């Protein structure tokens, strides 16, 4: 139609082929994941959100999902990232001990992906989706990312690291999924300390950003769960790159 019902992106061409094929790939890859059976997975991720009003879903629909994407993550490994996805995930392509949530089996399913269902009809809805802060925030997608989120930080022990976008007006905002969803799901019992690191703009190597009003603010926050605080500067990402990329360099 000339007509689209929601103001989001639709789904994702080809979806159903692509889940499943990372999945496949996945698992392949991993050999922890062996056992995982892709169809079941698909079948579980299709059953969360076909069928169902694409601003009534529930955490409770992608139990299913979450149960056979179960995986023993290295707690204390864990990097949560900020509004800076392309650094983080270079970090962790080349520091494989690492894991962000988008390395994990349901992470990387999902990453970059769109979807929704129709209520009262089996289709997915490659015209639009809800946007959740336009349409509806119990839409598939958001309420996908909340839940596994969720886990993710649940996970967490020791150290856990969040990587933060130094050049942003809110170097740390209570408003993303790290600030609203994860810091609120570490456990304090487990977690020892949440250190951030503040990676710089080109250009601007001197400013000391953990001084900065909002970084201020996520200390707080953590301090009052019981949980130590950490803050480190990296001034100048390119030489940052350079040794995680070769760590035997003599510069690092
Ligand atoms: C969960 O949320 C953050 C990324 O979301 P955002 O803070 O950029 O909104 C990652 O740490 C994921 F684990
Ligand atoms: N909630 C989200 O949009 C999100 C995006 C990327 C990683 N984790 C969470």
């Not at 979450?66 to 996805?85: A, E």
């Not at 905002?173 to 019992?189: A, C, I, M, R, Y």
């Not at 710089?200 to 769960?225: A, F, M, V, W």
Request: hydrophobic share 30%; aromatic share 10%; charged share 25%.
């Amino acid at each position: 139609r000339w007509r689209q019902t929601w103001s989001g992106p639709g789904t994702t061409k080809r979806f159903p082929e692509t889940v499943l094929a990372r999945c496949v790939k996945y698992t392949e890859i991993h050999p922890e994941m062996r056992h995982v059976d892709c169809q079941s997975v698909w079948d579980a991720f299709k059953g969360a959100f076909i069928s169902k009003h694409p601003c009534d879903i529930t955490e409770e629909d992608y139990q299913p999902l979450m149960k056979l994407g179960t995986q023993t993550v290295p707690c204390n490994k864990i990097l949560l990232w900020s509004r800076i996805k392309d650094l983080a995930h270079q970090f962790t392509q080349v520091q494989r001990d690492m894991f962000t949530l988008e390395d994990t089996l349901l992470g990387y399913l999902a990453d970059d992906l769109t979807w929704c269902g129709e209520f009262d009809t089996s289709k997915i809805n490659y015209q639009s989706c809800p946007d959740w802060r336009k349409d509806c925030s119990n839409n598939p997608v958001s309420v996908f990312w909340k839940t596994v989120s969720r886990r993710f930080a649940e996970a967490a022990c020791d150290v856990v690291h969040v990587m933060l976008d130094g050049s942003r007006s809110k170097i740390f905002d209570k408003d993303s999924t790290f600030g609203s969803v994860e810091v609120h799901n570490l456990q304090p019992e487990k977690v020892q300390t949440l250190e951030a690191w503040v990676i710089h703009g080109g250009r601007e190597d001197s400013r000391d950003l953990c001084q900065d009003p909002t970084i201020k603010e996520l200390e707080s926050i953590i301090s009052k769960r019981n949980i130590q605080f950490s803050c480190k500067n990296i001034y100048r990402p390119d030489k940052f790159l350079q040794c995680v990329k070769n760590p035997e360099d003599s510069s690092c």
